């Protein structure tokens, strides 16, 4: 017959390969495909939706709704209010939509949107500095050290939300999802720019945060997720 | 995938088959091919060269140069001088170039050239009858029984050699190399036609013989040669 050869990798079952397979049940006509609203073709479109960062994950607030906001007040001196380390393996990001999509992939490359919303009354105003320290830089611990990075300064009035675009600043072309020191993403820090001034002396505001992906965000090397375990058998 | 079948004779290693094989050492550039004189493309061209028949293979002369000639003399009556049985398995033919080529092949078909040369002085003359008895005929033992076959009569003077073309006379289309009684080739016999007359009374001549293939000679069924043995291990 026709001379053939079976090189290495012929009688192997790779799971992630693409092969054709003999149709069991031939002549089977499937049920018809109707227009169901909301069809998703790419899981990055799930990753691009704003999803709340659990910015108050401390050991009392986890398991409660009050882990999604921090409480701000009128202070005299500028304090660092909140630090989000730009890691997709950190539990701040990895429990969101963006992070639980990006935790399936070993690498990621793109820009992050982080949108802060202050829930307070209509008379509380305030200015906050939201700074992104690029990779290789220390966590600032001073506003003069934080304003030297990628920052925005947002006022409070008539709209509660403001978005900092954490840009893609990296040496390599892709950043690792499980954060190491070689490809660390940097830090996002929230500061008081001028204060938070409520209409009373002991008044408060509640700052939330959401994160999503920019359109230029890409992922590769699909892997297992560390955001799923199985220790017992599901029966 | 594409439906294939592996019939019988697929996973077999036949030695005489013709297959392609993966080149070990890829990118290897061989050394260049220069014009070397004498290139041989067909071993029949070796078989077509005149090569001396050991016509005196008797138990004293083998192992010596004097097995290639017989000695003739002045006789009164006609004597049968020499008989070559037309067998390619006979040690007369099988040790020549023609015979050691044709002993590799189980069958052969064609005509034989046999050239007799008389080495004597320039005054010795003689006439010899060289007869080829066709297959099925007895060995003649009389010149009147030998002249009824394919014969030539050659005189001696100014050139010492004469060729008898043993023609292809056979029932079948091919003759077996290992001679049997069904496909025997016949006999070639050398006779005195008139004498051998030397310039002295006890003078002698030395008749040699060479054999080769005619252009219409063919072989088939390449086999082992019986002209090679191996009893010890070559180390």
């Amino acid at each position: 017959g026709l001379p053939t050869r079976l090189p290495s990798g012929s009688q192997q079952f790779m799971t992630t390969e693409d092969e054709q397979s003999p149709n069991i049940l031939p002549g089977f006509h499937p049920s018809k495909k109707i227009h169901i609203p909301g069809m998703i073709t790419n899981v990055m479109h799930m990753a691009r939706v704003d999803s709340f960062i659990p910015i108050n994950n401390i050991q009392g607030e986890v398991g409660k709704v009050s882990m999604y906001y921090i409480t701000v007040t009128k202070k005299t001196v500028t304090e660092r209010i909140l630090v989000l380390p730009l890691e997709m393996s950190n539990t701040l990001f990895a429990t969101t939509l963006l992070g639980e999509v990006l935790n399936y992939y070993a690498n990621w490359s793109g820009s992050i949107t982080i949108t802060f919303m202050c829930v307070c009354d209509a008379f509380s105003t305030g200015k906050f500095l939201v700074a992104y320290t690029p990779p290789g830089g220390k966590l600032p611990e001073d506003r003069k050290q934080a304003m030297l990075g990628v920052h925005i300064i947002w006022d409070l009035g008539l709209q509660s939300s403001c978005t900092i675009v954490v840009p893609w600043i990296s040496s390599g072309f892709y950043r690792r999802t499980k954060a190491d020191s070689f490809t660390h993403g940097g830090y996002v820090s929230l500061w008081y720019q001028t204060a938070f001034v409520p209409p009373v002396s002991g008044g408060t505001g509640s700052i939330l945060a959401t994160c999503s992906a920019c359109p230029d965000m890409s992922v590769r090397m699909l892997r297992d997720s560390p955001m799923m375990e199985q220790k017992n058998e599901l029966q | 995938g594409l439906p294939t079948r592996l019939p019988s004779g697929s996973q077999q290693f036949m030695t005489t088959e013709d297959e392609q094989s993966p080149n070990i050492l890829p990118g290897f550039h061989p050394s260049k091919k220069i014009h070397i004189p004498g290139m041989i493309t067909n071993v029949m061209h070796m078989a077509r060269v005149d090569s001396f028949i050991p016509i005196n293979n008797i138990q004293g002369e083998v192992g010596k140069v004097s097995m290639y000639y017989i000695t003739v003399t002045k006789k009164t009556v006609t004597e049968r001088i020499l008989v070559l049985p037309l067998e390619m398995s006979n040690t007369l033919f099988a040790t020549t170039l023609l015979g050691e080529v044709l002993n590799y092949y189980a069958n052969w078909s064609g005509s034989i050239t046999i050239t007799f040369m008389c080495v004597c002085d320039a005054f010795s003359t003689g006439k010899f009858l060289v007869a080829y008895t066709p297959p099925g005929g007895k060995l003649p033992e009389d010149r009147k029984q030998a002249m009824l076959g394919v014969h030539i009569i050659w005189d001696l003077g100014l050139q010492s050699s004469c060729t008898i073309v043993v023609p292809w006379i056979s029932s079948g289309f091919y003759r077996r190399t290992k001679a049997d009684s069904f496909t025997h080739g016949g006999y070639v016999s050398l006779w005195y036609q008139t004498a051998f007359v030397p310039p002295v009374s006890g003078g002698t001549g030395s008749i040699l013989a060479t054999c080769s293939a005619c252009p219409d000679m063919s072989v088939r069924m390449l086999r082992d040669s019986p002209m090679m043995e191996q009893k010890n291990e070559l180390q």
């Binding site: 693409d18 092969e19 054709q20 397979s21 003999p22 149709n23 031939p26 089977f28 499937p30 609203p37 909301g38 069809m39 998703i40 990055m44 479109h45 799930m46 691009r48 939706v49 704003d50 999503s212 | 995938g1 594409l2 439906p3």
Partner: peptide, 25 residues
């Protein structure tokens, strides 16, 4: 691109964000 089994289910793997991220009127 050959279909070795002459069936649509027997093949290999086959091949807009704005319904999410902006579902406004």
């Amino acid at each position: 691109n050959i279909n070795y089994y002459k069936d649509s289910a027997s093949s290999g793997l086959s091949r807009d964000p704005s319904k999410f991220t902006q579902p406004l009127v």
